[PDB]
Design an enzyme around this catalytic site. Sequence first.
Site, short mmCIF file in Angstrom:
data_model
loop_
_atom_site.label_atom_id
_atom_site.label_comp_id
_atom_site.label_asym_id
_atom_site.label_seq_id
_atom_site.Cartn_x
_atom_site.Cartn_y
_atom_site.Cartn_z
CG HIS A 144 -2.14 -1.27 1.20
ND1 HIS A 144 -3.08 -0.95 0.19
CD2 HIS A 144 -2.49 -2.35 1.60
CE1 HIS A 144 -3.86 -2.09 0.72
NE2 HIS A 144 -3.29 -2.48 1.83
CE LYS A 199 -5.51 13.59 0.57
NZ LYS A 199 -6.80 12.49 0.45
NE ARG A 200 -4.39 9.54 10.71
CZ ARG A 200 -4.72 8.72 10.95
NH1 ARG A 200 -5.77 7.79 11.18
NH2 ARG A 200 -3.41 9.29 12.11
CE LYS A 246 -3.12 11.52 3.41
NZ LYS A 246 -3.33 9.46 2.13
CB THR A 279 -10.30 5.57 -1.50
OG1 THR A 279 -9.61 5.05 -0.34
CG2 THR A 279 -9.46 4.09 -2.52
CE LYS A 287 -13.62 6.45 0.71
NZ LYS A 287 -13.64 6.47 2.18
O1 LIG Z 1 -4.93 0.80 -0.66
C1 LIG Z 1 -5.62 1.15 0.17
C2 LIG Z 1 -4.77 2.62 0.87
O2 LIG Z 1 -3.48 2.55 1.65
C3 LIG Z 1 -3.23 3.37 2.26
O3 LIG Z 1 -3.78 4.08 2.72
C4 LIG Z 1 -2.48 4.32 0.93
O4 LIG Z 1 -1.97 5.21 1.40
C5 LIG Z 1 -3.39 4.72 0.39
O5 LIG Z 1 -2.94 5.33 -0.81
C6 LIG Z 1 -4.22 3.55 -0.21
O6 LIG Z 1 -5.33 4.25 -0.95
#
Ligand SMILES: OC[C@H]1O[C@H](O)[C@H](O)[C@@H](O)[C@@H]1O
Lengths: 830, 830
Positions: free
Chosen positions: A365, A556-557, A562, A664, A668
């Site tokens: 990830h 987001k976090r 970011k 993701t 959304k």
């Molecule tokens: O794959 C699920 C998610 O995992 C982590 O949070 C990554 O930073 C993100 O880019 C990805 O979309």
Amino acid sequence: ISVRGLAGVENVTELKKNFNRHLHFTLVKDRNVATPRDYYFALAHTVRDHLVGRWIRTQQHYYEKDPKRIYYLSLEFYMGRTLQNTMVNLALENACDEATYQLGLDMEELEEIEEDAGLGNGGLGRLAACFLDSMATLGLAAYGYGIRYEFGIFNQKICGGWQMEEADDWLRYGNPWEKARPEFTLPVHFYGRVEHTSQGAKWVDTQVVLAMPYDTPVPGYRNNVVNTMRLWSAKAPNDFNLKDFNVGGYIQAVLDRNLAENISRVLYPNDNFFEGKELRLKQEYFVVAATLQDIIRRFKSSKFGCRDPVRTNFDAFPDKVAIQLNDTHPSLAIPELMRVLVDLERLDWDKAWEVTVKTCAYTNHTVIPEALERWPVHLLETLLPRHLQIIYEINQRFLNRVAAAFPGDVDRLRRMSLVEEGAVKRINMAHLCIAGSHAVNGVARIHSEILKKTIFKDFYELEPHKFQNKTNGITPRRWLVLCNPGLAEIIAERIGEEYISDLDQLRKLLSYVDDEAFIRDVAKVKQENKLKFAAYLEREYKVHINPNSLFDVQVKRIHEYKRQLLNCLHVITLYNRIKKEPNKFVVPRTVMIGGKAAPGYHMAKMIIKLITAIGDVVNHDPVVGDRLRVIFLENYRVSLAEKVIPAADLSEQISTAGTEASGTGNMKFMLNGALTIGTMDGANVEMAEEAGEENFFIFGMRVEDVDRLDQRGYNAQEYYDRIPELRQIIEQLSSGFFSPKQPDLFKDIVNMLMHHDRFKVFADYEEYVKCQERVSALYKNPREWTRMVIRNIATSGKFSSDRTIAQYAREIWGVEPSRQRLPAPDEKIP
Amino acid sequence: ISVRGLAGVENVTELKKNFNRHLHFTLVKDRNVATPRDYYFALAHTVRDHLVGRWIRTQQHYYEKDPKRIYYLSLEFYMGRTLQNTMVNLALENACDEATYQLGLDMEELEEIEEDAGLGNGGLGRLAACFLDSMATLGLAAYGYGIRYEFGIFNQKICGGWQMEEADDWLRYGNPWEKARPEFTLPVHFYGRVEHTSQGAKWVDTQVVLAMPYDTPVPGYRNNVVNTMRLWSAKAPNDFNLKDFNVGGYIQAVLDRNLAENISRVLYPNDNFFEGKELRLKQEYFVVAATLQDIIRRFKSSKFGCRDPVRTNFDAFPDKVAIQLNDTHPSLAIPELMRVLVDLERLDWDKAWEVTVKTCAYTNHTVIPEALERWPVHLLETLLPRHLQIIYEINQRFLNRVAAAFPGDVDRLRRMSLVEEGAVKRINMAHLCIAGSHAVNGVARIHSEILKKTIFKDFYELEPHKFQNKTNGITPRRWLVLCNPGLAEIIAERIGEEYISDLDQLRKLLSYVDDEAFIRDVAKVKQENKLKFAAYLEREYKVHINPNSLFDVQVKRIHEYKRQLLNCLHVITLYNRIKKEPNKFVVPRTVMIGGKAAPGYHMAKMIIKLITAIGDVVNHDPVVGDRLRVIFLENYRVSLAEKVIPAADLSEQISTAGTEASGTGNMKFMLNGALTIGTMDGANVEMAEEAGEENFFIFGMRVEDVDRLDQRGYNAQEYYDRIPELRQIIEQLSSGFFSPKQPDLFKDIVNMLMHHDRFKVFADYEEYVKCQERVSALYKNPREWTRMVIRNIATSGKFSSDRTIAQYAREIWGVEPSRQRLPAPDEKIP
Ligand SMILES: OC[C@H]1O[C@H](O)[C@H](O)[C@@H](O)[C@@H]1O
Ligand SMILES: O=c1[nH]cnc2c1ncn2[C@@H]1O[C@H](COP(=O)(O)O)[C@@H](O)[C@H]1O
Ligand SMILES: O=c1[nH]cnc2c1ncn2[C@@H]1O[C@H](COP(=O)(O)O)[C@@H](O)[C@H]1O
Ligand SMILES: OC[C@H]1O[C@H](O)[C@H](O)[C@@H](O)[C@@H]1O
């Protein structure tokens, strides 16, 4: 009312009496003392009743037919509330809305009482939740396995503009969805030592912690399939955790049980960051150890635990089992599977290894170094002695494979090692997963290419067949139908309801891009959504916003990669331009930034304070008026996302090119009517490719430009020197313009931005504000903005997790998805 | 089948479908995977359904009528299993027996699966449980208040003849009877300091622990009354237990919550022994603090929280509230009531004191010094600063009362002080309770006299009106109808069923003392009971006994004052006599001794080892044969008592005269057909007085003889010198006859018996064995033994807790008992 199903006569009546049964018999209350919380529970219990019948037959079915089982191991499952989602998947929403209405209650008011299941940090944990829903919807015999933390991600509180963390006691009032299964409690071992005797090694003198499972139902979308999410809880044995005698204290012994039980007490609040603490490692082995015993027990029964070749032949194990590793967190599953097969079942190494590689698959990830799990050998050595031995042996044989493939390449040998030498020896968990898995995938096309070109280049050269891609996706059920019924309804009015489980059909909306009524409608639901959010804001958090302005939101976090900071620079620029020419017209904007910072992430917490600091100045400047508001969205979580995303006009996905694996949230926003301003990073590339770059607001450096700059050397001073607007902002931060009482409050941010910016914020600044001017220009033309919105929505079908899961199923698990309705829920009692 | 109620057609059918509803919807299982444990839960849930309707109307009733409320505060509630008892009180036993039978299940087998609610140590905790049942049966608006320990009294395991303790995880599988009420959570404070400002003192900077209540229903016997037992659980606040900032660790903060929650983690396993640990004191204040807020909230509503004189006048508080102190454990209720009235409600001292003395009443349970609670002042000083201040002030004013009553009596002043000077200053909790209560009672006539003559003589002289007696009693429902249906049935065959709630009617059985059929029947049920126990023994513990022998049983907590040791001396004497004249006939006996020893009570654990040591020798001597067996009953608890008592022939109540306050096990045996051999101690005096001394086997010193001996000086050597049989036994223990491998194993026992016997075991030896010969002589005459048994049973009516509760109600609480059936359970939904 909407296509939230039928509000049948017989069923609304049935629902109502059952609601009353529970309020009386289950909650032990009477209408005269019942509070909204009691009403929420009576409904929850009534709704849960509808899927137990289906839950029992689904599981009985898999037992009879005995298909290949998919086990999704993850230390995170970001579920959120589960009442509405269950109603939606069971086509119960309208009937329940009607029934509660007749009972004189507002269903929406009761839904807000349900606590979120925040057993996740962000992207990774939510993916798992979307995957579970899609796997059930596609009729796969899949099981979600994890840890039942009694405290999930902390609740964020903003005090004096600073984040304050407080325990998320989500179980305080109870969880009506889970079912404790104490009868399936399993033992898990820790510490001990390894004895090598005659016929095999033995893990001895271990400390035992018990794993008690809790099952939560996962209903598919209108197909009568209810899969299971099994979450383990730590429990102390009542013997040794009391019986290891010879003074200490009886009372103290009992109080000390909360030492073995601390294993499942709290989720580590780290997002894309590795912390090598012993408690974490224990959680990781705990979920792996308990889950595998369950997997093997289920296999031992199957149809082999009847006949078949007769002789526990694990040769068919990979044909009946598939375990997917969500990141390297459950990576000990590899050496643990070997330990059981070899030490307990007594298979030869090679046969066991063959079996292990064939059933395990790993998902990566992130590419940032600080997110990579590298466990110090002294920790593994003390806690899991036999697993370290198995890991060394795996490394030995793997490196021999490399030497044989690349004769004389001595550096490649040290680079690929699972064991890292240096200050302290560490085990590279990712190298372990690649070696013991038959497939390794990225989460977006560019990220997957980056894995092959960079981070895992050597491994790719060794076994090119292992590396794949599986672009992430989101579930259209929770992320469309549930959170945006208004938009779901108008789409259904034109193209039907089949798109809910076949998102590709949204493409048909392309032919309504010039339809006058649709444009008006698409625009109307967004306006209604903005109005509802603007209201919620004053309801629960208090202090007005303007619903006619452009809703600019980045949720987001909080991370340096970011770049919430890049967003900040833009906000300040807008403010400064207004103060320069006050009586000039500019498109009004409400920029909302929300997200949680990990408790120990100093820089992230400093960024949250900057955001609120900017709001303090901007929001109280009379000359600005209602043209610019800066709001920090408190406690961003799943349930809050369901509220902001549908109300967003602009989605901010501005990470430095090459750092966001996929993302993701971007998906959304795309499916919910927001336009996207972002960099060619992660899935943003595939989204712009799907909608057309003309309907996307892309800016900044591409991966190549970033690398070119790194060869050159990034010097922030250059940007500071050639851009006066940028210079003006940095000197404002430096002099205390945004922090009067503490003028040097933001020295760490300025210092970082000028001397150690790993994500080159200044390099994208010019193109970012230039690009932002272009979205403002387009917002001034409502008709064209909406038409472009329609182009995004109509083209978002590829980003459904149903497509992602179908690909995992076919290209990795070797199973075929099926949209076949299971044979009704109908009573039955054998 | 028996008078376990009617097995109606409509209700057996109704029960069955509901059993199935729960097995499916509640347990989420299907007949094909259901285990006996699942079946027990479906039944439990089905039975619980029948009393929620009654539970809700009973509580609603008390709210409407608003009677005087009785609050029974106790740190112990020895409940046991609650399934059968609920069926019995709801007249559901036969219907449930029938229904489960038709479902193809054995109800008795399912009942054995229920875990005991062991939230008690022994006598004191069981009394509370019997009281609760009687208060509900007599229609009193009573509430049981205590702590919901997650670990009750430890499960006792015998290893190598030694007791082993292991955690009693009674909640492991869940408790279907309780109802968590998180919505009524209350805060409790600890530590802090006291600020004296302008208008009153303020308790400040305290640590907050939350008290979450759990209600368990307490059904009366066939009257539709279901009272409540509220048990508090400790919970950590999510703020300060995380929010007190400035480094330490976010994770550690969350893990540290299990520090405030340890308050309700485990019951102290001490019986008649005081341990001054901080954790205990915290449990004591925790139950008191939370309960009082609840009591005051309920009062503030009543009918005053409507109108009445209008002005929160607490003058009527004592007319609406009565709080009974079960021992000095909840004694902080006195200074806590003052603190609230004075500090919070702002009443003047004197008005508040008047109110407090008028609502509180104290019950004393023992006269041994080591059982008395004397808390070190430095502990109270640190933990509850304001309460210490209030206690000093209470002492000040009380002592002034004494000085005024006894001018110049300076010693009496120090003797009566609540504050004890010396090594460390202590607070005498009992003196506190006498001063702040309008009534103080003993638990048996002789114990109550002893309180006035000795321990509390000075207080009695000051206020003679405060001291009362309330002879303990047991509930005939659980202790007759539930555990001995066979005996209940034959009694009902002759005199009806009204005796179950009017035990005095058993006297009518006196006219059947010469009835041939009754004698045969009384004798038959006892034989059937012995056969069932003898079987259970081999079933669950394994190694045969002879059901034709005299069942000699002594079951209670292991103590030096209970004298299990005196029993041991007799057992060894029997053995030695048999070995001297093997071919001489002696009445066969199975002597069973069972009970738990506190973990730190060395002497008690040594006594358990002696008992098993004697069994090792006696039980394997071929010459003894089946004439003498010595068995140690493992894990003696409520559910085990329900099994042994009905099967007992001889009850052993042999404590040193003047040491056992009352005892209740003695009563249990009397009502179940056992003859009693005992000393003129506790309630034994009232029992022998009720049955006639001719039908009782009384031996040994009376209180007077004990005191005479103490004046003289007790010299054990004298007895050792003049009794050869006794000498022979001590030399056997000394030389290793009972411990070959460790010859000096029992030196502590011999040493104690010869030099520091506080309970003069040797002084009663001769009369005890002489008396035992007399019971053997009578057992040889079955007809006369049974006739004497009938004289005991027929005369045990006075020892019902219904009589005890009726007296508390009238002479202390000022309320009238009522055997009026509450208006049915009938549906209703307002
Ligand atoms: O794959 C699920 C998610 O995992 C982590 O949070 C990554 O930073 C993100 O880019 C990805 O979309
Ligand atoms: O041995 C068995 N006999 C009959 N049904 C079984 C058996 N084992 C599992 N099942 C069924 O399969 C479901 C799956 O249970 P699992 O082992 O938790 O996956 C169960 O709830 C039962 O319906
Ligand atoms: O304010 C009130 N209105 C109506 N009924 C109440 C009210 N307070 C208590 N009751 C009833 O009294 C029962 C007693 O509640 P308690 O306060 O826990 O004793 C409740 O379950 C209700 O039936
Ligand atoms: O009053 C209840 C019981 O409390 C204690 O256990 C006493 O030792 C006992 O004699 C009494 O019967």
